[PDB]
Amino acid sequence: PQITLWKRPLVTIKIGGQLKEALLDTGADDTVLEEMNLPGRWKPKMIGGIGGFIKVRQYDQILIEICGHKAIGTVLVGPTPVNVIGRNLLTQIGCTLNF
Amino acid sequence: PQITLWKRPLVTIKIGGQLKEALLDTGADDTVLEEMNLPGRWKPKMIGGIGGFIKVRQYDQILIEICGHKAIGTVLVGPTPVNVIGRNLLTQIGCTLNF
């Protein structure tokens, strides 16, 4: 589809058998999701933006479905104020910027 | 143009007669630039990102050309990790997400 940017580009996603809302964020290198208790191992990470850094848990090879488009890659989990789909997964669904 | 997301969507902008690089950031409501001298009146505001809130200077009705496309809108100036072009200007240049 085509998504205009008059409002936040929020879409439904499916991850670990849960449905959530997340932003398609070209400014996010990597996907970051609200605190959720995912299974399996993980590595600590720190990600920075406006205001400083937050600590997150990095899971790899996580399967996510975004508007029926499947992807699999890194998902960071932590106390983020918003769920964002980052470039690492936006590439996998063929998402482009156009003007 | 069409911009894929395998790398950061960085583009050259012209503001206050100066060239700079900036990130097209669909996850930003607002446009936030690193510290710089801008002619015009400004107002103190706060803006919050993933890591908390920062102090910025709000410049209204600023002319800014993004990748050869003119926009006139609000520009926040402050200690952001990187220049980001947010939706308030992305809408002006006709930018959409497509997959």
Ligand SMILES: CC[C@H](C)CN(C[C@@H](O)[C@H](Cc1ccccc1)NC(=O)O[C@H]1CO[C@H]2OCC[C@H]21)S(=O)(=O)c1ccc(N)cc1
């Ligand atoms: C360094 C590039 C850019 C700032 C990075 N950010 C993504 C960005 O889209 C955030 C994503 C974001 C959206 C909402 C809350 C917190 C972060 N937007 C943002 O900070 O925008 C601010 C400016 O406009 C305002 O509207 C939104 C907040 C204000 S981020 O949230 O900090 C981020 C950093 C690393 C990863 N892997 C994923 C996300």
